[PDB]
């Protein structure tokens, strides 16, 4: 064991204990690859924890500056200001692979944004959180997940990305709604006739259901859109990817058998992963 493969270990740590389903699935990518995705998750990771570290913008900015060294220095020593483990992975995946350091830097302005939360009024806003804090990641990814990179990969991949994002909002009403977090558009609250305080107070209706389901099925369409444009990733990533969607695409179903509650997470079992990775594993 090097130093460098400590520092990924770390990395793959992160992933695992904030999310079962997606260690599940990029677990099982090739060696180098799998890597390169434990770094950049838990760089993402990392900055989406980052303002509870104090309870202000210090410890995000030198994650910020960090990353620049990087992207600026990317074969210089750095002596990393905020996590090193996690910067040394990650410059040691830069100096193999193109990553997009813009994309980093819209997450992290989407963490900065968040500090001052107010409701989305319109979906389109809510699609731009997306974007910023789930479409970047796939942005991120992209290089890794696939063997030559055009315009139409990174449109997959970021759409991915928004439609897990999509599906955790759906998940997390209710645990989103005690920390002071609604991200269903009040455009889309008020036509639907839906109030989350009140729903949470006195348990779910049809309006409520009628608005879970109208996301849901905006979810179920692009994770429809990924699927059909798969071929863009590469030939190894590709049921990788398909786990991690359909995985994710089970937490849909999830909700609704626990009748839409608000007052636990739900969750898709270890073994049923193990099941849709059979399914999937037969058709590659
Ligand atoms: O977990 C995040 C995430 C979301 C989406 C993808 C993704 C994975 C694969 C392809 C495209 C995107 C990765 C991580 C990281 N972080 C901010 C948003 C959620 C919650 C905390």
Redesign the pocket.
């Known amino acids: 064991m090097t130093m460098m493969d400590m520092n990924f270990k770390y990395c793959h740590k992160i992933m695992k204990k904030?999310?079962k389903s997606?260690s599940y699935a990029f677990d099982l990518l090739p060696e180098d690859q799998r890597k390169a995705v434990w770094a950049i998750?838990a760089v993402?990771?990392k900055?989406?924890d980052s303002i509870d570290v104090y309870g202000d913008i210090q410890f995000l900015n030198q994650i910020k500056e960090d990353i620049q060294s990087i992207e600026k220095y990317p074969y210089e020593y750095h002596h990393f200001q905020s996590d090193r483990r996690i910067m040394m992975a990650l410059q040691h995946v830069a100096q193999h692979k193109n990553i997009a350091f813009q994309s980093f830097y819209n997450?992290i302005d989407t963490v900065y944004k968040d500090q001052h939360f107010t409701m989305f009024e319109t979906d389109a806003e809510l699609f731009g959180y997306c974007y910023g804090?789930?479409?970047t990641?796939?942005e991120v990814?992209t290089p890794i997940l696939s063997d030559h990179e055009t315009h139409q990969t990174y449109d997959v991949?970021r759409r991915?990305?928004e439609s897990?994002?999509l599906i955790?909002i759906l998940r997390d009403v209710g645990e989103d709604f005690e920390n002071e977090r609604i991200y269903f558009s009040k455009q889309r609250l008020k036509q639907y006739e839906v109030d989350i305080a009140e729903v949470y107070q006195n348990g779910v209706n049809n309006h409520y259901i009628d608005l879970w389901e109208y996301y849901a099925a905006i979810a179920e369409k692009d994770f429809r859109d990924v699927m059909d444009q798969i071929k863009v990733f590469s030939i190894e990533a590709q049921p990788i990817?398909e786990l991690?969607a359909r995985i994710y695409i089970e937490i849909l179903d999830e909700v609704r058998q626990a009748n839409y509650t608000l007052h636990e997470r739900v969750f898709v079992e270890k073994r049923k992963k193990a099941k849709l990775f059979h399914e999937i594993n037969s058709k590659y």
């Open positions: 904030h999310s997606f998750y993402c990771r900055i989406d997450l804090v789930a479409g990641v796939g990814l991949a991915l990305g897990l994002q955790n990817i991690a």
